[PDB]
Write an enzyme that holds these catalytic residues in place. Structure first.
Site, PDB file in Angstrom:
ATOM      1  N   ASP A 193      47.864  73.943  45.909  1.00  0.00           N
ATOM      2  CA  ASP A 193      47.144  75.003  45.203  1.00  0.00           C
ATOM      3  C   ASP A 193      45.687  74.653  44.957  1.00  0.00           C
ATOM      4  O   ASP A 193      45.316  74.039  43.952  1.00  0.00           O
ATOM      5  CB  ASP A 193      47.856  75.400  43.898  1.00  0.00           C
ATOM      6  N   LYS A 195      42.032  75.800  43.934  1.00  0.00           N
ATOM      7  CA  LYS A 195      41.444  76.866  43.150  1.00  0.00           C
ATOM      8  C   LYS A 195      40.420  76.310  42.174  1.00  0.00           C
ATOM      9  O   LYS A 195      40.450  75.126  41.853  1.00  0.00           O
ATOM     10  CB  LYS A 195      42.539  77.643  42.420  1.00  0.00           C
ATOM     11  N   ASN A 198      40.833  73.573  39.733  1.00  0.00           N
ATOM     12  CA  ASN A 198      41.058  72.208  40.203  1.00  0.00           C
ATOM     13  C   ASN A 198      39.777  71.517  40.686  1.00  0.00           C
ATOM     14  O   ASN A 198      39.816  70.387  41.203  1.00  0.00           O
ATOM     15  CB  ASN A 198      42.076  72.202  41.337  1.00  0.00           C
ATOM     16  N   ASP A 211      43.561  67.176  39.524  1.00  0.00           N
ATOM     17  CA  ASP A 211      44.880  67.835  39.429  1.00  0.00           C
ATOM     18  C   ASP A 211      45.660  67.925  40.748  1.00  0.00           C
ATOM     19  O   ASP A 211      45.677  68.963  41.411  1.00  0.00           O
ATOM     20  CB  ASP A 211      44.812  69.199  38.723  1.00  0.00           C
ATOM     21  N   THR A 232      50.581  81.050  39.090  1.00  0.00           N
ATOM     22  CA  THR A 232      49.827  82.131  39.683  1.00  0.00           C
ATOM     23  C   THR A 232      49.711  81.998  41.207  1.00  0.00           C
ATOM     24  O   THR A 232      49.399  80.932  41.736  1.00  0.00           O
ATOM     25  CB  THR A 232      48.406  82.082  39.114  1.00  0.00           C
TER      26      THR A 232
END
Ligand code: 0HD
Ligand code: 0HD
Lengths: 397, 395
Positions: A193, A195, A198, A211, A232
Site C-alpha cells: 500500500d 500512499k 507512508n 510504514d 482503505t
C-alpha cells in the site's frame, strides 16, 4: 573460501542478519523466563530450579540491555491500532528519534503476531537514503519497540493539505517515490500500500518511505499473495482487489498503480476513484476503464495525463511492467533542475522551518493512550505467548 | 557504551551464565523440550519451531558433537554412564570421554553433581587433577572430554604387582598432595579410592571422578544426610550421616587414604566382608575390627600411619592440617622431597605400544546388550533445563 564449523558458528553469533546472533539468543532466554515464571509452573522442579539459577542474571541482563525507560516521550505523533509512534529523546545521549510501539497483548489476541518481520528487515537493512532507517529494535513482556530516524518534515498528506501543488513539485515527489519503490523492489519486497500517508519528509525536505507493515517478500517469479487485506482501497490496484477474493498472485506492478493514483491526487486535488463510500470506491476502481476522468479545470500537461493513464491500466499493459527504466524515460520527468542520479542533492520544493530538534509542527498532535494494560490469564501450563517475539531485538552497531 | 561493554563481557566470560555457550544451550534445550505432537497443538509452539527448524539443525551440526570423535574402546562404567577412549576424527588427538545419561540423572534425581565435576576439571589447572578440555551435550547425554591417562588406575597396578613400602610411600604421598590441592579449591572429594587414582604416561598420579565432590562452607564443613562413596572406603562419619545429622569436614578423605595404604601393604581391604552389610558393620566397629595379619613383616611406622588415619575423625591424622601428615615418619626418605615429588622418577613407568594403548584397563564389553531411554511429554516438562550451561570450550 573454506571455514571451519567453529568459524561458521562464530560468524552466526556476530552477524546482524542472523537469527542466532547474541541479541537474538538473549531474547530466547528472556522469553522463556517470562513464560515459565508463574506459581503453577514452578511446581515442576525442572522449571523451579532453572528459574532460581537464572533470575539474578536475568534481572541484571534486563537492566543492562536497552529498554523503554531509557527514552523520554516528548509527544505522540501517530497511532496504528496495534500501538503508536512517539517522539522520544534518549536519556544518556540526548539524541531524538521516532519510536514505534507494538502491543503484544493485541497481536496475540487478534492473532496477528507475524506481520512485523518484513518491516524490521527492510528498515534495519535497506541502507538507502529512500528508506527510514531502524536504529534499534527491542522488547519487554508488553511491547515491541522500534527506534527510527525522526522525520520532522512530516508526511505528504499534510503537505498536500497546506499547499497547492504545481506540476514541478509533483514531478519531484513522484520521482523520489519511483526511486524509493525501486529500492524496495530491488530488496525483493512488494510494498502493497503506497500512499501519501507512508511518505515522510526529512530535515532537508527529501522523501523517504516509512510504514512497511504490509510488505511481502517476492517469490522467484516476483509474485506474492496478499496475506492481510488492507484498509482503505483508494490507492489499491484492481488486481490486488480481485486477488483478495481468492483469485491469485500479483507482482510489483501493483505499486506502480499506486504511484499513478498519487500523481493524480497531487495534481487534481482528489484521488481518481474517490467516493463517499468504501463500496463506491471499490466499484469505481474495478470500473477504472470508464470511471477514470480528468477534471473540468485545466488541461494539465499532456505528459502528466499521459503518465497517470500509463500507470492506471490493466497490469499486462501497465508502465513499469518492463522495469523501472521505462518509467524514468517518460517525458513527464524531463526538466532543468535535477537528474535521476542527482535528485537527492537538489534543493527540495519545501524545506521545513524547524524551531527545535523537538519541533512537531508538521504532525497532527495526539494526546496519549491513557487506557489500561490488559494481561493474559495466568498460565496453568507452558503457553509461550513470548515465543512469536523471540529474535526481534536488533542493534545497529 | 559502558552498558554495551559489560554485556559483551558477560557474553565472553567462560564462567558467565549468559555466555555464548549457555545462550546456545538455552535455545537447543528449548527446541528439544518443545518438539512433540501434543505440544505442537499450541500455535505459539508450532510456529516457533517452524521458524527455527533450519537454524537449530545448522547449529547442532556446527557445534562440537559426539560424531566428531571416534570411539576406540570403553574403559570404564559408572551406572550413570561410561568412559570411552576416543580419537578426534580430524585432529587425531586422543582423549578420555565420559558420558552421563540425562535419563538416569533425572530418574534417580541427583541431576546437579556434574557442575562441580566439570568445574574442578576445567579450572583446577593442577598437575594433580585430570584436565577437562571440552564439555558438550545432546538430548541424551552430557559429554566431558578429558586428558587420557594411559597408565591406568591403582587397582590395575595392585593387581599386577606386590607393592613394596617404597612404592606405597610414593603413591600415598602423591595422593596426599592431590587431595590437598582439591581441599584448597574448597572441596571434599568423598570418594577416594585406587579406582579414582590414575597414572599418566610418566607414571605420576592424578585424581579423577569428582562426581561425589561437595563444596565446603566457610567453616570447612559440609551438611549432608546421604552416605556416599564406595563401601570399602567409606568413613564412619559419612556412613553415619545416613539418616540425619551429618556435618563433617575434609578429614573423611584422609580416612580413605588409610584404607588405600592398608590395601597396598596388606593385599586385602581392612574392612572386607562377604556382604555390604558386614562391611558397614565392620567400619562402624572399626576400633575393634581393624587388625593386621600375624605375623606380618610390615614396618611399625607404616602400621602407625594406617592406624592414625583409620580412627575417629576428631583425632584423625590430618585433623589439624596437611602438614602433620607430611611430617609422619612413614614418609621419611632420602629419595624425594615433598615440594619436588612430581619431578622424580615414578616407581612404574608404563610401557606403551601406541597413543591408543589400552593395556592398563580391563577389557570392557561395548554394549553386548540392547538400547533404550525416554518418556514422552503431553505438556512442557523441561527435562533439558537442568543441563543448560554445561557446554564448555577450553580456549
Ligand atoms: O507515524 C507513523 N505511523 C502512524 C500510524 C501507525 C502505524 C503503525 C503503527 C503505529 C502507528 N510512522 C512513522 C515512522 C517513522 C517516523 N519518523 N518520523 C516520524 C515517523 C512516523
Ligand atoms: O573411567 C573413569 N571412571 C569410571 C567410572 C564412571 C563413573 C561415572 C561415570 C562414568 C564412569 N574415569 C576416567 C577419567 C579420566 C580419564 N583419563 N584417562 C582415563 C580416564 C578415566
Amino acid at each position: 573460501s573454506f571455514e571451519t564449523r567453529f568459524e561458521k558458528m562464530d560468524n552466526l553469533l556476530r552477524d546482524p542478519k542472523s537469527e542466532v546472533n547474541s541479541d537474538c539468543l538473549l531474547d530466547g532466554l528472556d522469553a522463556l523466563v517470562y513464560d515459565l515464571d508463574f506459581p503453577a509452573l514452578r511446581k515442576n522442579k525442572n522449571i523451579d530450579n532453572f528459574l532460581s539459577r537464572y533470575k539474578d542474571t536475568i534481572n541484571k541482563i534486563r537492566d543492562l540491555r536497552m529498554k523503554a525507560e531509557d527514552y523520554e516521550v516528548v509527544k505522540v505523533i501517530g497511532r496504528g491500532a496495534f500501538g503508536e509512534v512517539q517522539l522520544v529523546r534518549h536519556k544518556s545521549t540526548r539524541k531524538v528519534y521516532a519510536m514505534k510501539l507494538l502491543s503484544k497483548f493485541e497481536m496475540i489476541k487478534r492473532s496477528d503476531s507475524a506481520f512485523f518481520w518484513e518491516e524490521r528487515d527492510i528498515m534495519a537493512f535497506a541502507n538507502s537514503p529512500w528508506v527510514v532507517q531502524l536504529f534499534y529494535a527491542f522488547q519487554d513482556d508488553r511491547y515491541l519497540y522500534m527506534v527510527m530516524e525522526y522525520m520532522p518534515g512530516g508526511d505528504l498528506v499534510n503537505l498536500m493539505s497546506n499547499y497547492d501543488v504545481p506540476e514541478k513539485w509533483a514531478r519531484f515527489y513522484t520521482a523520489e517515490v519511483v526511486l524509493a519503490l525501486d529500492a524496495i523492489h530491488s530488496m525483493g519486497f512488494i510494498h502493497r500500500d503506497v500512499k501519501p500517508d507512508n511518505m515522510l519528509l526529512d530535515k532537508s525536505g527529501h522523501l523517504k518511505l516509512a510504514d512497511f507493515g504490509t510488505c511481502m517478500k517476492m517469490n522467484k517469479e516476483g509474485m506474492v499473495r496478499c496475506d492481510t487485506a488492507v484498509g482503505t482501497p483508494d490507492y489499491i490496484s484492481p488486481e490486488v482487489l480481485k486477488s483478495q477474493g481468492g483469485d491469485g498472485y500479483y507482482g510489483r506492478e501493483c505499486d506502480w498503480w499506486s504511484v499513478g493514483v498519487f500523481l493524480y491526487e497531487m495534481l487534481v486535488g482528489d484521488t481518481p476513484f474517490y467516493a463517499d463510500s468504501l463500496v463506491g470506491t471499490y466499484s469505481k476502481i474495478m470500473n477504472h476503464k470508464n470511471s477514470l476522468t480528468f477534471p473540468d479545470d485545466n488541461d494539465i500537461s499532456k505528459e502528466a495525463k499521459n503518465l497517470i493513464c500509463a500507470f492506471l491500466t490493466d497490469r499486462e499493459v501497465r508502465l513499469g511492467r518492463n522495469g523501472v527504466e521505462e518509467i524514468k524515460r517518460h517525458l513527464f520527468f524531463k526538466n532543468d533542475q535535477w537528474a535521476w542520479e542527482t535528485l537527492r542533492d537538489t534543493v527540495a520544493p519545501v524545506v521545513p522551518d524547524l524551531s527545535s530538534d523537538i519541533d512537531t509542527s508538521n504532525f497532527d498532535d495526539l494526546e496519549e493512550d491513557k487506557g489500561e494494560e490488559e494481561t493474559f490469564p495466568i498460565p496453568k501450563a507452558f503457553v509461550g505467548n513470548q515465543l512469536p517475539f523471540v529474535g526481534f531485538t536488533y542493534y545497529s552497531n
